[PDB]
Design a protein around this ligand. Sequence first.
Ligand SMILES: Nc1nc2c(ncn2[C@@H]2O[C@H](COP(=O)(O)OP(=O)(O)O)[C@@H](O)[C@H]2O)c(=O)[nH]1
Ligand SMILES: Nc1nc2c(ncn2[C@@H]2O[C@H](COP(=O)(O)OP(=O)(O)O)[C@@H](O)[C@H]2O)c(=O)[nH]1
Lengths: 289, 301
Amino acid sequence: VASIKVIGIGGAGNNAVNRMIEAGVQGVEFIVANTDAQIISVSKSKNKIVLGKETSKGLGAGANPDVGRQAAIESAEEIKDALKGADMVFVAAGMGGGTGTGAAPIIAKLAREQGALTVGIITTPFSFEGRARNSYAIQGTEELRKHVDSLIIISNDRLLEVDNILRQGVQTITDLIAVPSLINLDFADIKTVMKNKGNALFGIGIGSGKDKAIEAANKAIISPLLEASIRGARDAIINVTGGNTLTLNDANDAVDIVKQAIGGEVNIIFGTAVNELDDEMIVTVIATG
Amino acid sequence: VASIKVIGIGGAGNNAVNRMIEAGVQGVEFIVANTDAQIISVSKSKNKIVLGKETSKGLGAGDVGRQAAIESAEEIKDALKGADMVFVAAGMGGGTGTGAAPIIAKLAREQGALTVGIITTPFSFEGRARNSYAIQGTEELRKHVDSLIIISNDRLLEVIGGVPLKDSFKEADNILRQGVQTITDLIAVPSLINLDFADIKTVMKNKGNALFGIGIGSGKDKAIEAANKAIISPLLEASIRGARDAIINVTGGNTLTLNDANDAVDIVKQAIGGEVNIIFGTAVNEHLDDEMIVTVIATGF
Ligand SMILES: Nc1nc2c(ncn2[C@@H]2O[C@H](COP(=O)(O)OP(=O)(O)O)[C@@H](O)[C@H]2O)c(=O)[nH]1
Ligand SMILES: Nc1nc2c(ncn2[C@@H]2O[C@H](COP(=O)(O)OP(=O)(O)O)[C@@H](O)[C@H]2O)c(=O)[nH]1
């Protein structure tokens, strides 16, 4: 009977081990390690390691992998004790943060020096987690690869299939000023909606096929980006973006849905813009006050 | 014709401006500012600013963002001069964006621009310190803009993934489970067809990158469907063509036939080609109804 251990490192690895326990994976001992003692406390695993207990003190490592690496080096002997006797160790972690990125290679090294067949299985971050977290993941992937027998890499980008966020907020307003279309707004109109207004609200929604206007305008008004708060606003800008075949009536039908949701006496400017859309119509809103 | 400028600050802001330039956004001047001289150089923006080249000396900020921006005030004023509207784009929580954005917004608004902040705030998995640094940065930026559009990265994840935050990584958690269980069921859970640990060791010891694919199929041709989906699975980093060893796990319900399992193994063998050393086993999963799942781990390139 082979002795098999899975050690999940950092938050992603801790949640993956939770999923394995919950799905009844048999034949395996589970261990979780983290610099954050909070995640560790709600773990379903009965083998719990707080990394860097004397230095990070269970408070978490933050963003820098160097802290997670130093944390695991400090806990080397307790990691060896938990893994002792394994024929095979899986090191599970999400690349991109301070703990999994930096601690996973140290734990793999200790498992393999103990004599275990050591397999890393990791994720890499969404591109829209940004360059710092993706760059860290690249470096941690290579360091882990040095210390595992085999390395399995699962891309969160690809797992998607099976962001333009800041771009879309900007274009929402600027296409209506600088790119002539069916309906546009003067710069002075934007300025009155947005001068000295404080917090503004962004929503978005898309709708394919006929009556795509009703569908897209309804998704926009309850977009999670709005956080369920659109009604009452004193002013609001509405962008209706679509393809070549975009009737001014479809635009008016979309804006109608939203004027109802806003309220009474709401200054609602709006306009259009054409994009590269098979009956697919996108509605964005920004509302203030 | 109004003069509109976007100034992207730090990594998230530099990223945003690249996306706008690549998408061909029209009628807007773009500017990028970062303490990191390297990320700037690669940028596709005509107007570049290395913030605080004396304080940071071209090294990223990791309070350092704010000081870098103050020291660069002249270059910021000069790039923004003449704007009717300035979008100050940044991701809150980092070392550059969080400190620099409110200074850049202050300069832009004192020059006379309608100044709109548009910012992300962090994923909760980025941690409490990151998230509290972002809140400070947000409340400081809000003092110096006309209006502030705030995009929570947690909500962006829901919008992109289509799933509540609690379940945003359920599928990734589940794939990591299946990667493990692909092997461990075959070693440790008794079935018609198990594998010896020594033979797993042959496939996986001192190998480097192991490719992983999964596919599910149903109905009459479920084996053809499941196996082919596994060998062109988007999870695969590269083609399995040419691998020197592979483990195949065939999992099914109580109606799965020897022929079904044999067809799936044969499909993977032909797709890899050559003299690949293939080992395989089976597992039962009774939650499956006229379905089978094929997973492959290939090594050796
Ligand atoms: N599978 C899984 N991946 C996650 C989860 N949360 C975040 N991630 C991904 O894993 C990466 C690392 O996050 P985390 O493990 O929480 O970082 P750390 O604990 O600070 O090292 C993130 O960049 C996300 O891409 C999760 O709950 N499950
Ligand atoms: N949605 C999105 N968020 C990002 C992106 N890049 C960074 N962020 C967020 O912005 C925060 C600051 O990251 P970053 O700008 O690279 O740090 P800085 O350059 O040192 O200020 C990160 O914690 C992420 O939450 C991106 O491309 N898309």
